[PDB]
Design a protein around this ligand. Structure first.
Ligand SMILES: Nc1nc2c(ncn2[C@@H]2O[C@H](COP(=O)(O)OP(=O)(O)OP(=O)(O)O)[C@@H](O)[C@H]2O)c(=O)[nH]1
Ligand SMILES: Nc1nc2c(ncn2[C@@H]2O[C@H](COP(=O)(O)OP(=O)(O)OP(=O)(O)O)[C@@H](O)[C@H]2O)c(=O)[nH]1
Ligand SMILES: Nc1nc2c(ncn2[C@@H]2O[C@H](COP(=O)(O)OP(=O)(O)O)[C@@H](O)[C@H]2O)c(=O)[nH]1
Ligand SMILES: [Mg+2]
Ligand SMILES: [Mg+2]
Lengths: 427, 51, 46, 51, 426, 427
């Protein structure tokens, strides 16, 4: 049971760069790369006593990549695996998908090939990218397309970072987002949205860190990814692998967009006071005050929910709490799924990172659900796309690169078709 | 531009309230005394064994 | 310890999925098998 | 005997409260004395000025 | 948290504020260099109301000095606690209005107000949640009254939901500095009654009377008068800066004192005030402070409150006191002299306690009375205004600048019907 | 069996500052939070060696709240449980009911929700407020209203603090009182009046403290609260829970306004000298010189009475004493009931607080009755509300906040209707 993780863009490689710090800490690997079976899903033992990760950071601008190449984890990552171009796509989907991808994707994929050939029981892929940028959006889509034509049958977990409604750092990210989804629909099997404002409000409210840099965000996102793969890495009382989300969370081949949530995100002082039990963290995983996407699930209806439990959890009280949730009437399910849940329990508790702000708690919950609020989000991005496109603003950069108006109109109607699908499914 | 003066500036302005309530990465500390064991050796929350 | 030498653990002296430095220099296979020590490379891996 | 121990505790806490009140009122009177002597110095320096 | 922005206009306003920031800084224990050196940790908790953190323990006040002649600025930087103001808050003209309300409202304002508005707007959004503004100025001078008055109008226009204090001195004929006093006071009051939330009326005549009788001072320079007004302003905002057994901020004091939206001219007093000779021959009890509060020779207006009725009244106490004595003292003073209070409002007295006394005293008090004896002073001014306007004396230095005659008629009518409605409620 | 206590306003959390000081000394809990099952109704035991109360302090101004945060009980109260707004309501009902409540009440209710879900056998709520102020009256009514919507059937003990007739500190308290009652009628189940002037008289007469502050008042208020929950906390010969006042003291759904009293309020030198028995304290609890509300029940006729007994008391003599009360003719009962009492006996004597002015007493009484003198109090306040509203005084403040004259008129007539109800039932 082995899974490889590729990182596309400047956001993706900063996230996984927090992830791999978490992984080496969870498996007791000092950053030089040697130990002082459970690891084998990430680190492949090779060379001399070296556990080198199954991962490739790939990006066009060398600033952040060589930053990694000089950082603390110089000796961890295989040198060949960090692919770095010479010049950026510069927040331009056409530039990342047609100009520069055409030289970079073949090298990326035929690395991927020899990583998969070293692999034996490959479970699937998982990608890290933010669709607002240029490289993570453009050549990411090109990479997923050629990976799908390479394997197809293997499940691909896409942990994307969408732009927030009001807090935003670019101008053309509506164009990048729309063009990124148009391929994320028919290539990714399971795609998890995580914007930045939701994490901002979490870090402000629960973790009471008020000037949060990007690491605090990346740190707790790494906690979420580690939490939903701990079932593969460690034996639990009730384990679920990466193929389960494929079956149990995707009721229709085009409705695959999953809100994430985590609990308890609690500091050291708030831990010494709250009593940490199972019923209240199950409650805490359901209010929009602890979701990783700024959306209102009260306006939506759930399709299917999944609950990962880590640490000291017995099946009795998780069944009890889930009973309480289903008997509450504040939140509601669709008329299709009376069995709207899927629980999972693992033994190993979540670990602490020194310098991080999360205390060592006995247990934790990672909720991954499916709803119609995501359908509200896509319409929100669709409106602000149409406004800028009505004046043909910024279009000349894409046309100058080599793209045209055809795919703009057809990607627009594709999101309109997705909207009509969500409105048809919700009824 | 020197480690010393750079550190003495912060040692001086540590008396500020915002300097204690907005530690860029740390977060608000509250200065509460813990019972010497909940930070490192024992984890927080109620404990009933499963294993 | 240094990067230029191998970082191998003392138990996984010589194995198949792992090795970059010679476990033992100048030890013949037939010599070792006659001494009845089990062939190091044949040990299994998960 | 539990009753006896309790009223012992009561007497102890009584003495503690008395000591705290005494030290506080003393600090207050000291602050007053310093402000008064400052006033007196301001009163004398103006007379020096007129002379 | 709750924030107070300070604004000082004119020469009087500037020197009042100089003594004010001296006293407040001495309360919070910050040295004239600008660094904390106090003793108790109660002082650190509520200094954001009056200061901002600059660099290495540097707390700069949240004040804006404003005038039209450099001499006042020099006198500001000369004294101690003059190196603590931010020099960018020294927004400051160059020509000088000079006892001309028209100059201070149309000629020089048209180019100083844009800059003072920029600095006050930057100082307003610099904090999170404003409590209100606090303006110390005069009603006789030109650059103080007129300029401050338009600033009040601009501020109330931009920030309508914020409170607003105006410590304004009024001219009196016994101590009368200039000649156009009623020409400036009448117009400024006409604008205050429609713009300001409430005003604390002060005057120099009553202050000279206090320093003569009670303080028994020989040479009452302006330092002590500004020292008394500063002690008053510290007493009125003590509730924000220090915890208490019964808190009363500016807004609740306003809602307790103002029954009708045009009845917001208060007279103020302060307690205790005793001479140096008789300073240790007295006791410190709540009755002792109350008899000095409700004394008529302790009000800071030239308006004997026993010549009319009170509408409402408030008393802010500082020090470790017994609230039962506080309430029964207020009830005794209310039940004894029942004619001095209005009948259709029961319990005309609001009270509040704070546990931190001013530096030097064990127990102090601040009285704020909304009486109807103020119409005496406003009639005292309006009768001088009609005497001059009857034959247009001094009128052309205003007329030739943009001001017209209907403005003076309007100020007459607004002053006249205001004192009519004070008389009506009497 | 658990009961949670919420404190609203400046007076509320100062009462709490005395109540929790009393509870911790009762159950032997140091202020740092740990002992060196009777506590289970007030403190939930998190983790290991830590009990955290079932309370929420709330206010709009942060002055008194962070005085608590920096006081001696920093560790005892959960950091999140203390709730503080940004700016005060400023003695303004409309401001504290429509302008700032709309921001604070959601956070408060979404906090008490997770406190209740922590709880298991919730008996009810008990609220602490004063109606003279702005914060206590306005969002106190708003919070009670939405609590009645959320739970409804659970009992709510309201220990309100009404303004005294002649001794008073505010000016617009008649407006705030009337407007607070108008919703206190149909929201509270059991409402107990506490007036400051009567407590000043008690401290002057019995405790002989000629200079009392608010600390002493809140100390013996905590004594009263502790005395009527001691039945829930400890077992006695004849115990009585929180649901019994609901039945035994409220004869009609809109007549629930209980006088309270306490005996013996005795200093340190008057105990070691008076010979204390049950007959004399049963007497002394009935004189108007020892009630907690300045009114003359000689003018009124009792509807029902409840007698809490703590300490060394047997059921025989308490029965003999209540017989003497029933046979005395200086007080009279209503004909609408021949059985006018409900006794209650608990074993544990009332504890003493360090620095407190009361002595170690063997036995004590807490009387909670219901009469028509309260109907006299409401008319007395109604008079001085008419006086100020006849001249339209202070109205512009409330109308500026967004209200009208309709609620003044209807609250006025609602109090008149209630006046009709007392004079009708008294017949
Ligand atoms: N969560 C998270 N998001 C990040 C981080 N850094 C950048 N982003 C997001 O990345 C988005 C823009 O894409 P980038 O990753 O900055 O750059 P890119 O995707 O490589 O595209 P190019 O700039 O053209 O190379 C922004 O909207 C950011 O929100 C990070 O550290 N954490
Ligand atoms: N018994 C008692 N009453 C108090 C105490 N503190 C304040 N009060 C009463 O509270 C009433 C005024 O309301 P406050 O509690 O002071 O303030 P508030 O209720 O929060 O209303 P705002 O001031 O607008 O915030 C007064 O009539 C006092 O009698 C106290 O410690 N004990
Ligand atoms: N209390 C006090 N009053 C002052 C002071 N200086 C001036 N005044 C009063 O202010 C009035 C003149 O105001 P002025 O300073 O000319 O105002 P400006 O010309 O607008 O700056 C006179 O009646 C003085 O009584 C001072 O230092 N203290
Ligand atoms: Mg980039
Ligand atoms: Mg209050």
């Amino acid at each position: 049971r082995e899974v490889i993780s590729i990182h596309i863009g400047q956001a993706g490689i900063q996230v996984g760069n927090a992830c791999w710090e978490l992984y080496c800490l969870e498996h007791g690997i000092q950053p030089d790369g040697q130990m002082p079976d459970a690891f084998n899903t990430f680190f492949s033992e090779t060379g001399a006593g070296k556990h080198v990760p199954r991962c490739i950071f790939l990006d066009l601008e060398p600033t952040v990549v060589d930053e990694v190449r000089t950082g603390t984890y110089r000796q961890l990552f295989h040198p060949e695996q960090l692919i770095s171009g010479k010049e950026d796509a510069a927040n331009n989907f056409a530039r990342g998908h047609y100009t520069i991808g055409k030289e970079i994707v073949d090298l990326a994929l035929d690395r991927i090939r020899k990583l998969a050939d070293n692999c034996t029981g490959l479970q699937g892929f998982l990608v890290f990218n933010a669709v607002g940028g240029g490289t993570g959006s453009g050549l990411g889509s090109l990479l997923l397309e050629r990976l799908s034509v390479d394997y197809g049958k293997k499940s691909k977990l896409g942990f994307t970072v969408y732009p927030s409604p009001q807090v935003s750092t670019a101008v053309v990210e509506p164009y990048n987002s729309v063009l990124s989804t148009h391929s994320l629909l028919e290539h990714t099997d399971v795609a998890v949205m995580l914007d930045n404002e939701a994490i901002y409000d979490i870090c402000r409210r629960s973790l009471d860190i008020e000037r949060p840099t990007y690491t605090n965000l990346n740190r707790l996102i790494a906690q979420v990814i580690s939490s939903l793969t701990a079932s593969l890495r460690f034996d639990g009382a009730l384990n679920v692998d990466i193929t389960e989300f494929q079956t149990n969370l995707v009721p229709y081949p085009r409705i695959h967009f999953m809100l994430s949530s985590y609990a308890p995100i609690i500091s050291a002082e708030k831990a010494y006071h709250e009593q940490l039990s199972v019923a209240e963290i199950t409650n805490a995983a359901f209010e929009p005050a602890s979701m990783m996407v700024k959306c209102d699930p009260r306006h939506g209806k759930y399709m299917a929910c999944c609950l990962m439990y880590r640490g000291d959890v017995v099946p009795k009280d998780v069944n009890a709490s889930v009973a309480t949730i289903k008997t509450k009437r504040t939140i509601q399910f669709v008329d299709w799924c009376p069995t709207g849940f899927k629980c999972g329990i693992n033994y190993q508790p979540p670990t602490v990172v020194p310098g991080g702000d999360l205390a060592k708690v006995q247990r934790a919950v990672c909720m991954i659900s499916n709803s119609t609020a995501i359908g509200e989000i896509f319409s929100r991005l669709d409106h602000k796309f149409d406004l800028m496109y009505a004046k043909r603003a910024f279009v000349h950069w894409y046309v100058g690169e080599g793209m045209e108006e055809g795919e703009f109109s057809e990607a627009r109607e594709d999101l309109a078709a997705l909207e009509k699908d969500f409105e048809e499914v919700g009824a | 531009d020197s480690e010393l003066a750079r550190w003495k500036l912060e040692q001086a302005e540590g008396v500020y309230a915002s300097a204690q309530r907005e530690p860029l990465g740390a977060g608000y500390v509250r200065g509460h005394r813990l019972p010497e064991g909940l930070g490192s050796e024992r984890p927080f929350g109620v404990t009933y064994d499963a294993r | 310890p240094t990067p230029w030498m191998d970082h191998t653990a003392p138990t996984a002296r010589g194995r198949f999925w792992v090795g970059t430095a010679p476990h033992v220099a100048h030890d013949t296979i037939t010599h070792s098998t006659l001494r009845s020590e089990p062939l190091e490379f044949q040990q299994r891996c998960p | 005997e539990i009753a006896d121990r309790m009223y012992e505790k009561v007497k102890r806490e009584m003495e503690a409260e008395m000591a705290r009140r005494e030290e506080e009122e003393e600090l207050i009177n000291m602050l007053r004395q310093e402000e008064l002597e400052a006033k007196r110095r301001q009163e004398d320096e103006d007379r020096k000025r007129k002379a | 948290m709750r924030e107070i922005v300070h604004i000082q206009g004119g020469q009087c306003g500037n020197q009042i504020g100089a003594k004010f920031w001296e006293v407040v800084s001495d309360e919070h224990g910050i040295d004239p260099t600008g660094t904390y050196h106090g003793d108790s940790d109660l002082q650190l908790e509520r200094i954001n109301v009056y200061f901002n953190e600059a660099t290495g323990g540097r707390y700069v006040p949240r004040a804006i000095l404003m005038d039209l002649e450099p001499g006042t600025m020099d006198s500001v930087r000369s004294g101690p606690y003059g190196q603590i103001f931010r020099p960018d808050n020294f927004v400051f003209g160059q020509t000088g209005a000079g006892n001309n309300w028209a100059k201070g409202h149309y000629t020089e304002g048209a180019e100083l107000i844009d800059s003072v508005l920029d600095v006050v707007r930057k100082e307003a959004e610099s904090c999170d949640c404003l409590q209100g503004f606090q303006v110390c100025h005069s009603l006789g001078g030109g650059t103080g009254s007129g300029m401050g008055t338009l600033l009040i109008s601009k501020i109330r226009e931009e920030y309508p939901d914020r409170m607003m204090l105006t410590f304004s001195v009024v001219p009196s004929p016994k101590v009368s500095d200039t000649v156009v006093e009623p020409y400036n006071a009448t117009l400024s009051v006409h604008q205050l009654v429609e713009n300001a939330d409430e005003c604390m009326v002060l005057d120099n005549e009553a202050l000279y009377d206090i320093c003569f009788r009670t303080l028994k001072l020989t040479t009452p320079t302006f330092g002590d008068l500004n020292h008394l007004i500063s002690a008053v302003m510290s007493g009125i905002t003590c509730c924000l800066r220090f915890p208490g057994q019964l808190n009363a901020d500016l807004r609740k004091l306003a809602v307790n004192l103002i029954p009708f939206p045009r009845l917001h001219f208060f007279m103020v007093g302060f307690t205790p005030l005793t001479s140096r000779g008789s300073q240790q021959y007295r006791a410190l009890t709540v009755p002792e402070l109350t008899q000095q509060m409700w004394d008529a020779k302790n009000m800071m207006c030239a308006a004997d409150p026993r010549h009319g009725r009170y509408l409402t009244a408030s008393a802010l106490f500082r020090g470790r006191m017994s609230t039962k004595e506080v309430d029964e003292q207020m009830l005794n003073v209310q039940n004894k002299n029942s004619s001095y209070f209005v009948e259709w409002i029961p319990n005309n007295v609001k009270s509040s306690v704070c546990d931190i006394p001013p530096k030097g005293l064990k127990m102090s008090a601040t009285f704020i009375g909304n009486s109807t004896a103020i119409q005496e002073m406003f009639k005292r001014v309006s009768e001088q205004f009609t005497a001059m306007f009857r034959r247009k004396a001094f009128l052309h230095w205003y007329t030739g600048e943009g001001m017209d005659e209907m403005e003076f008629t309007e100020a007459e009518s607004n002053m006249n019907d205001l004192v009519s409605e004070y008389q009506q409620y009497q």
